[PDB]
Design a protein around this ligand. Sequence first.
Ligand SMILES: *[C@@H]1O[C@H](CO)[C@@H](O)[C@H](O)[C@H]1NC(C)=O
Ligand SMILES: *[C@@H]1O[C@H](CO)[C@@H](O)[C@H](O)[C@H]1NC(C)=O
Ligand SMILES: *[C@@H]1O[C@H](CO)[C@@H](O)[C@H](O)[C@H]1NC(C)=O
Ligand SMILES: *[C@@H]1O[C@H](CO)[C@@H](O)[C@H](O)[C@H]1NC(C)=O
Ligand SMILES: *[C@@H]1O[C@H](CO)[C@@H](O)[C@H](O)[C@H]1NC(C)=O
Ligand SMILES: *[C@@H]1O[C@H](CO)[C@@H](O)[C@H](O)[C@H]1NC(C)=O
Ligand SMILES: *[C@@H]1O[C@H](CO)[C@@H](O)[C@H](O)[C@H]1NC(C)=O
Ligand SMILES: *[C@@H]1O[C@H](CO)[C@@H](O)[C@H](O)[C@H]1NC(C)=O
Ligand SMILES: *[C@@H]1O[C@H](CO)[C@@H](O)[C@H](O)[C@H]1NC(C)=O
Lengths: 291, 291, 291, 185, 185, 185, 185
Amino acid sequence: KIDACKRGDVTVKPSHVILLGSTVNITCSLKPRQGCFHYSRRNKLILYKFDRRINFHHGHSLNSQVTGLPLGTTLFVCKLACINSDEIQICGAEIFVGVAPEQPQNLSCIQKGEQGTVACTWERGRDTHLYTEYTLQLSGPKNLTWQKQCKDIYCDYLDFGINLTPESPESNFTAKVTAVNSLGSSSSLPSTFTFLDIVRPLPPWDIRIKFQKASVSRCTLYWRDEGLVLLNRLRYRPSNSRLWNMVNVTKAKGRHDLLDLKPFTEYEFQISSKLHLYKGSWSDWSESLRA
Amino acid sequence: KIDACKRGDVTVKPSHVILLGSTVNITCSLKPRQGCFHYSRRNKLILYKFDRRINFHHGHSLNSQVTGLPLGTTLFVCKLACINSDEIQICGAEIFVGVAPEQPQNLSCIQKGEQGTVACTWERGRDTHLYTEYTLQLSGPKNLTWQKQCKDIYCDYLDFGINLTPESPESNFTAKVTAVNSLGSSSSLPSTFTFLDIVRPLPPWDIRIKFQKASVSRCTLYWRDEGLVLLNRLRYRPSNSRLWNMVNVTKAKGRHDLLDLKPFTEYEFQISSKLHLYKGSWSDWSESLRA
Amino acid sequence: KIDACKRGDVTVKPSHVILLGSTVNITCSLKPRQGCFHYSRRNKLILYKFDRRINFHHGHSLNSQVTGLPLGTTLFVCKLACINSDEIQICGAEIFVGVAPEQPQNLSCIQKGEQGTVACTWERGRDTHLYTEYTLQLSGPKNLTWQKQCKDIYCDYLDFGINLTPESPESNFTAKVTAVNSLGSSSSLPSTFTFLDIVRPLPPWDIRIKFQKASVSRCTLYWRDEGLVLLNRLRYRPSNSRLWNMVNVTKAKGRHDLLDLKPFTEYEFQISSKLHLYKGSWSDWSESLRA
Amino acid sequence: MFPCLHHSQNLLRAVSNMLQKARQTLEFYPCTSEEIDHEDITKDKTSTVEACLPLELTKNESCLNSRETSFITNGSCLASRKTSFMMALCLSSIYEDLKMYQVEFKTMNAKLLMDPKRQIFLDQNMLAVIDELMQALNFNSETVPQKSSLEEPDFYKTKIKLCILLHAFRIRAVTIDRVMSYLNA
Amino acid sequence: MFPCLHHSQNLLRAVSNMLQKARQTLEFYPCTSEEIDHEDITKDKTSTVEACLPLELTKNESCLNSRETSFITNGSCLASRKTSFMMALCLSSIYEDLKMYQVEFKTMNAKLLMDPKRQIFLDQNMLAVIDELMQALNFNSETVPQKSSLEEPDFYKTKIKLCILLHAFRIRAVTIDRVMSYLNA
Amino acid sequence: MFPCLHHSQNLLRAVSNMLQKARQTLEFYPCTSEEIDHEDITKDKTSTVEACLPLELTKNESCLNSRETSFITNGSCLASRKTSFMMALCLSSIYEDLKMYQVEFKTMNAKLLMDPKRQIFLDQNMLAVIDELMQALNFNSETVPQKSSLEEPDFYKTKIKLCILLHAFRIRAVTIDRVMSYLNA
Amino acid sequence: MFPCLHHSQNLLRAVSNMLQKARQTLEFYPCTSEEIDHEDITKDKTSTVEACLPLELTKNESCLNSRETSFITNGSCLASRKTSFMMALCLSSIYEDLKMYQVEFKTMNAKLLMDPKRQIFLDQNMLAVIDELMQALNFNSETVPQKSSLEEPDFYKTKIKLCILLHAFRIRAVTIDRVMSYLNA
Ligand SMILES: *[C@@H]1O[C@H](CO)[C@@H](O)[C@H](O)[C@H]1NC(C)=O
Ligand SMILES: *[C@@H]1O[C@H](CO)[C@@H](O)[C@H](O)[C@H]1NC(C)=O
Ligand SMILES: *[C@@H]1O[C@H](CO)[C@@H](O)[C@H](O)[C@H]1NC(C)=O
Ligand SMILES: *[C@@H]1O[C@H](CO)[C@@H](O)[C@H](O)[C@H]1NC(C)=O
Ligand SMILES: *[C@@H]1O[C@H](CO)[C@@H](O)[C@H](O)[C@H]1NC(C)=O
Ligand SMILES: *[C@@H]1O[C@H](CO)[C@@H](O)[C@H](O)[C@H]1NC(C)=O
Ligand SMILES: *[C@@H]1O[C@H](CO)[C@@H](O)[C@H](O)[C@H]1NC(C)=O
Ligand SMILES: *[C@@H]1O[C@H](CO)[C@@H](O)[C@H](O)[C@H]1NC(C)=O
Ligand SMILES: *[C@@H]1O[C@H](CO)[C@@H](O)[C@H](O)[C@H]1NC(C)=O
């Protein structure tokens, strides 16, 4: 059995993890068999924080009560100094000062495209100086559920690998995030999302410009995107200065008889689609098409 | 959108999932545009359970109140019979009669060997005729829990992939199992297990028989097993008739000066080891060694 | 097209490859458009072998006749020195002096075990300072041959991937090796080998020592080897001093009633097998068995 | 021998076995070819019905509507410089047909698993064959993400829709097989 | 971290080690950067010199000459809908640059092996890195066939051409590395 | 060239880099060879100290204690009929030494990850090299299961134990390298 | 389900199809079970006839002759600590039976290819199944080297020997299948 501390053992009261503001009783105790080979009233049993002397007792039992510890870890190492020999490190304690975990104030779940993996994002709050474990739970109408745990201390987001297929377009799904640390536990308020709110249409991948198969000013734009789109929007703004973009386009993959400027000067084109007008987010504008 | 039901739609009150004993209002309704091409007072709108007639209304609206449904699924299909044409299936409902889920009375977690994956086993109880989801949670001394879901309707056991390394041999770890179904939720009582209780030593893999390097009756048995064993037991029973096996052996991988019968007749040998005498399960007897 | 020589071109007569003893006419010629920018009777057109001056002509045409070149490669580089500018390398020639290739005096083909890949070995002879290509051809009684080329300049042996299954134990197979180099070609004399000569039995892999299941001096040796062995030999020599080993053993995988010394002192044991007594090579002695 | 033709022959055989299982499992649900209407999900989205024809059969080229969905995705089934556009558009449309069906079949299977009993579930082997064929058809193959629901759907509707899709898919599988045979010969 | 950037960083390091070996092996042959002229085989064939620039640097777009060699081969290094055409043309041109060099390097190596001694031979690891990067750059990667000759070439000319190519290739390798770093960030 | 020797040379180099990182990360924790006692976990369990010697050095064979732990596990590093028992026992004992260390190193790493900060964590590459060498040493390789704890251990004790193990393991790594060199030559 | 049992069931089916082909191809050569004598090449070399029995059937253990050919080769089909020696010896003997047959079948196939016509040749799939089963049975599997002859053998003798081996091998294949079923249950 490998043992880190052989000469003596050091105890901490109440524990290595303490609430910000508490006082720890670091006590260095030396086993009777171990000790300075020659008894002398010169040898000492020092205690050091970051190699800084805090106490010194000739006797094997050393007691200290450190206070006002800041957030972080402080290494208290208790070395033995003999009469002529160099100091031998005996044992030490690492103390993590921590505070109660922040509750996530805002939780949002976004699925990219009709086929996508749901991803939920939260505001962690102040960082407790402690290991942090995050649990994300998603439940449907009745209480079935999916849970995943983000063991990583810092998590940008947690993604449910399982895709969500909604039994009906109007359903209620509720998501909650729980943060647990040695000192305490904070749980976010339940947030209820309908499937349309979670889904976000993909930007239209395709784009084509045709001048109505003619030299005429009128232009026809042939783009392609996800099948379930009941709305759309197009940018007809002149390239040199942005002006106005039509709020809505008809449910046509291929634009027809769009009003375009008579010159053939290059014009930037951007396109967006809305899965549902009543409760669907707008898609990101498609890569600009030059001319 | 492929539509299974076009001619008409059938509704169920309150829902397809009902508690054992409840009564469902299956109501078959026909859309006005669809119907018998020739109005006649001969055409009917039948409702069938497992192809057995339960009701018949000439009018488009048919109402039924089935009662005393047993546990299981009953297919109520509502067909349209016209005057001379054959019956056209219009729409149907599948009803799952279920009961509240049984709580697991006993939960036991066993880890095989010093290095093993913890596996927990429970008594499911009566089978509710419904989809069953089982969640197994393991919490250590402070609150840090591993979340695993057995989505399979029948689960013999759920295994935690991560091996448990105990900070100290005496620690308390608590395990709970939760069963959730459309109708209700039952959670097993928390059971607290120390690491020694969970661990079960492996049967000694190796075995060797030597007669003290001599023709003498005394025999030496050279076996090998997991390193952390503080106890052991050996079977010295005569092969022809089992007699008695020593309760404990010294902490020796290689037995020495064991009392063995003077004849060279074949003798079966079995060996077991105990990781901890105070709170450790006995290992399974090793494969019998002939002679 | 990256062009190595732009300022001028150098020719060699007869060729870069020459027989040992021949004289090469290295001639450095400068294209008219290229040359020293300022005509002066100070600029020279030097020719260097291993950066050692051999000739110098002011005129664009430089002629040299190097003689007594030793075996190897000599780099003749022809640089241009102008009046004040540093020498610019113009073009160069690498000459490989070589001699006619040695014929392989001895060719032997050995197959390891009943199942083995035939491998043929030859004595290359003196190394010609030239690229060497070796072709090994094996022809059976029927005029069908396997063609394999050892393009590597130095070849320890060439191995035929296909195993040879002999239509009859007495057959004649003939093997020849051909060496070809820019200067000449030498072919080894055809060597005819019967299948028994090519095959060499594997050393017996297994060995067991038993004293006739008793404390008696007589010993029984249970070894295992390739199935088609019609002979065998055993080493009964005392371990401390080698004495004599029996010339032949009966066709028994397991030796029985072998005469062994009464003491139990450790004895080395070696075993060999002969596939055919009339024309089969002896197998290598098996790993010594201690005691 | 054409490797894609072998995959297509495997596809038709896999659908034939699954269709036989579906009829046996769903005894009451009507799943005979006579009682099941033909409905094709890919009716307007893809041009397999027109583009996938023998070169002799297609001539006017007027009916190919403005190079409909002319993505012409390059793939390992053919070679880029090997065959005419008429077969290049066809291979892309066949890839799209398999993508539309696989996404739907996975959605049905995820709903079927929730059933308290296991009356019927889509063949894992058949789904794997569809994915393997798509990988050869187009290099930029997208693997459908595991689909699941947090609620329980009506099972009768899924079982009627399943039978309607299986029969329509079987007709599509023969059409793919005919094209693969033409490419081989 | 960008996987193609890691391959490009591996390429520059592999060329640096091979260039050091070449200078040590060919003591007389002049292989110092001062005595070796810069000659680029891909001078007019590819548009890496112009297309591969940071988006901020390229603006008029007039200098891109009529979308020169605008194959825009799709590949695993980028995603089809991820980056602007300026980087799509650049990745195709980089693939073409590596194809032109690998075909030439293999031809030189086959001639070098015939030498009675083994003064120098192209690093197998460097050639493997070039192939691995090309596979990521374009799905339709063509593997060069084993090249050999039935006669023996002059070795001095091959050794001078080798030094000229190695130095030019090293400059190309840094240019690829800069583009990969820009794509990552 | 011996493949196991290459793995052993990789092991010694990986430990050397990890040991340098450990000294830099733990500035206060004493991790110099002078202040760290030599403690070997495999002191009595394995016979590598005695079995792994050049054939010339070992002669009396009396010191090999009753074929201690003579499992003689067959493996891809040597061939079954290739070398003497003295090296067969040595290869088995080396496999056992790597198994004892890997199980312990994984336990330490699982405790280290829980630290609020990331002052030090065992090199994943070093652990992978240990597993690769064990796979070659013995066919019946056991992969250690992912280890985790439901509580937080004192970190100072783990960091002192880590330094003691790293230095002892480095000495073991040189011993394995010497044996692999002897097998090659 | 037992993976080795699946391989053994594949083996019996493969032999059954090859045996049917052999009878159809060799119309004159007598290949009916009635006219072909039973001759087993592995008559004395292996103890499959005695060792491979259900545990209930074998009791006296006297008939196992002095642990005949008791190599007990460890393998992936069983686990080292899983089953009794009676099945461990049986698995080794079955591996040896497959090695004796595969070496002979390859020798016959190499002679059959030389025939001016292609009346019959051993099924490549059947040979592959024998190799796959052997790999699972014993880790130290030896792959038979490609066999060839430099002369042409009489074909009638090879075709009579072939029929004698196929029928005997089929009986051996059922014996392996029975043992695999017993191991599974
Ligand atoms: C620390 O120890 C001192 C004396 O041993 C005692 O008076 C005090 O209450 C202790 N405080 C804590 C927080 O344990
Ligand atoms: C679902 O869970 C919530 C909170 O646990 C509870 O209030 C509600 O009654 C549950 N619903 C059912 C149907 O069990
Ligand atoms: C979801 O909840 C909202 C408000 O709580 C309610 O208006 C709506 O009907 C609910 N939807 C369903 C499907 O129950
Ligand atoms: C069923 O319907 C009838 C009449 O429509 C009504 O009287 C009864 O209360 C209903 N019962 C349930 C359980 O809905
Ligand atoms: C741990 O959890 C249990 C139940 O949730 C609770 O009673 C206990 O106070 C918790 N302990 C801590 C330290 O949070
Ligand atoms: C575990 O719990 C038991 C009883 O609840 C208690 O006696 C024991 O001290 C506990 N162990 C620890 C480490 O707290
Ligand atoms: C070399 O050249 C000289 C003069 O050019 C000529 O006399 C001589 O014959 C030549 N020798 C050979 C071997 O070409
Ligand atoms: C075989 O080849 C040798 C040499 O080429 C020749 O002498 C002999 O006649 C040949 N035999 C036949 C049968 O062709
Ligand atoms: C092989 O050649 C030798 C001598 O040339 C001859 O005695 C022997 O009969 C030959 N064998 C065959 C099979 O022809």
